[PDB]
Ligand binder design. Structure first.
Ligand SMILES: Cn1nnc2cc([C@H](CC(=O)O)c3ccc(Cl)cc3)ccc21
Ligand SMILES: Cn1nnc2cc([C@H](CC(=O)O)c3ccc(Cl)cc3)ccc21
Length: 289
């Protein structure tokens, strides 16, 4: 892949935007809109295709949680619907293992899901797997060494520092070491041998702190803070660097895009999105055409 794709998000209402940033030249490209506006969704890529998963359409004419999975083909610049999930999942997290998409947690109205389901592109089918031990919305999800991690979030009552791991061949969840920080709507991704959790909301404040979990040591360590406090950010990895996109700082719907260089342990401002927004879906794949 070469571009960072950001899909959907929220500013005043849920958004249909699909725009792609090229780190190699600083350029933004506006591409085909989502068929349905949505915020609180997740993005991922499988086989070169971009998927938009879950979310909610917050709109003046009503609020609708999304069970939708939609597929964007950069070759054609077209969105195609796929099979829908078992349930709507706003403020979802997702992870890809072995070409399958895991949809994790999220909300449907006042239901905070612990349920998890898995999509198989070759069959266009979703199937439920073992539920998490905890209900989590605004859940951070990442994959390392073909294990799936669910990190932080909101269980309906408390924002969470807890995290858990799913072992596919056991179809089983187990708790891991909790983070040192309560975080809901953080950005969670993998880089090298570590799960990173950037920012989030704790029920009182939006956070700039960043910590990472080393699967070998089973401990969380803080790294340098982002320049901007943010919850409901998008996060992705592009060429061995973390990028964080948008979110909310308690005052502004951020257009800020920051990137993290693990070797210098520094965050730097890279570009700004064309407009401020929170709750985007983000993933990396090839240039269109
Ligand atoms: C249209 N508009 N303008 N400012 C807003 C703030 C919120 C709340 C916070 C509040 O109510 O102050 C909110 C903002 C961001 C997240 Cl991620 C979650 C909730 C909701 C809609 C808003
Ligand atoms: C005022 N404020 N600031 N940041 C917030 C985040 C949420 C939730 C998580 C929660 O309720 O803990 C949220 C999580 C993820 C996404 Cl994409 C969007 C919203 C709710 C209010 C918030």
């Amino acid at each position: 892949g070469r571009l960072i794709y950001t899909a959907g998000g929220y500013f005043r209402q849920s958004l249909s935007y699909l725009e792609a940033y090229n780190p190699s030249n600083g350029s933004w490209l506006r591409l085909a809109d989502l068929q349905v506006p949505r915020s609180g969704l997740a993005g991922c890529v499988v086989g070169g295709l971009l998927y938009a998963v879950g979310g909610r359409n917050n709109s003046p004419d009503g609020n609708t949680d999304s069970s939708a999975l939609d597929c964007y083909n950069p070759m054609t610049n077209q969105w195609s619907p796929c099979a829908s999930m078992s349930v709507p999942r706003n403020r979802i997290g997702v992870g890809v293992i072995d070409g399958h998409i895991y949809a994790v947690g999220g909300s449907h109205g006042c239901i905070h899901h612990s349920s998890v389901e898995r999509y198989e592109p070759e069959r266009d089918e979703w199937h439920l797997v073992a539920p998490m031990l905890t209900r989590r919305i605004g859940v951070g999800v990442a994959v390392l060494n073909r294990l799936l991690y669910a990190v932080g979030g909101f269980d309906g009552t408390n924002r969470l520092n807890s995290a858990e791991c799913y072992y596919p061949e056991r179809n089983e969840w187990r708790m891991i070491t909790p983070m040192n920080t309560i975080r809901s709507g953080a950005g969670v991704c993998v880089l090298h041998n570590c799960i990173y959790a950037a920012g989030g909301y704790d029920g009182q404040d939006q956070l700039n702190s960043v910590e990472r979990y080393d699967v070998e040591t089973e401990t969380w360590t803080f790294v340098a803070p982002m320049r901007h406090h943010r919850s409901a950010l998008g996060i992705t990895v592009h060429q061995g660097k973390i990028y964080v996109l948008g979110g909310y700082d308690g005052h502004t719907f951020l257009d800020s895009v920051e990137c993290y260089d693990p070797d210098s342990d520094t965050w730097s401002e890279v570009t700004r999105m064309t407009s401020g927004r929170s709750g985007v879906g983000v993933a990396v794949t090839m240039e269109p055409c």
